[PDB]
Design a protein around this ligand. Structure first.
Ligand code: NAG
Lengths: 49, 49
């Protein structure tokens, strides 16, 4: 094996799919989702490498 | 919100953007109209009686 599948996942749509109240509640958690997306993007860049 | 370059600068929290491709926001089609579909209204209770 050489590479995985370059999969990326959006929190706001996953956790609170098209929901205003849920998105507002999710804002309180800070950059959990920014760092989730950062980890997944780093993985994908590594796959290309 | 002025332009994509400004979105990139805001996401990176920087004024100088090193060469590359950056994921800034998420595209999402918003729903236009609402649809409500229910079975045919039948057996109207005899308040006439
Ligand atoms: C009683 O009959 C009249 C005429 O048919 C109708 O307008 C009225 O709504 C009926 N009453 C009820 C409770 O349906």
């Amino acid at each position: 094996p050489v590479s995985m599948t370059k999969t990326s996942v959006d929190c706001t749509m996953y956790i609170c799919g098209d929901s205003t109240e849920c998105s507002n509640l999710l804002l309180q958690y800070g950059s959990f989702c920014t760092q989730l997306n950062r980890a997944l993007t780093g993985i994908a860049v590594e796959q290309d490498k | 919100a002025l332009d994509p370059l400004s979105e990139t600068k805001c996401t990176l929290k920087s004024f100088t953007v090193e060469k590359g491709i950056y994921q800034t926001s998420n595209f999402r089609v918003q729903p236009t109209e609402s649809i409500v579909r229910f079975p045919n209204i039948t057996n109207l209770c005899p308040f006439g009686e």
